[PDB]
């Protein structure tokens, strides 16, 4: 699932990208850790869930 992307999209529209969103405090354009974050996050789907 898209980790985070700005605000509400319009109905029936997708979100595929590798844009490293700087949702955190600084406008970092790195990879992860703080600020600069990957736009997508994966679910922890296990049979134990």
């Amino acid at each position: 699932y898209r980790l985070f992307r700005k605000s509400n999209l319009k109905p029936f529209e997708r979100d595929i990208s590798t844009e490293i969103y700087q949702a955190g405090s600084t406008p970092c354009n790195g990879v992860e850790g703080f600020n600069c974050y990957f736009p997508l996050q994966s679910y922890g789907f296990q049979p134990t869930n």
């Binding site: 319009k10 109905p11 029936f12 529209e13």
Partner: protein, 40 residues
């Protein structure tokens, strides 16, 4: 124009053909739907 494309999602091919005038169109992309008008 035909260039290095990528993971293509939609693809429709019309029937092949071989080819003073007006040709007026309309493009409408509303709620994810692309609408085309025409007149000759």
């Amino acid at each position: 124009v035909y260039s290095s494309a990528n993971n293509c999602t939609f693809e429709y091919v019309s029937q092949p053909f071989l080819m003073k005038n007006l040709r007026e169109f309309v493009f409408k992309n509303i709620d994810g739907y692309f609408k085309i008008y025409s007149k000759h």
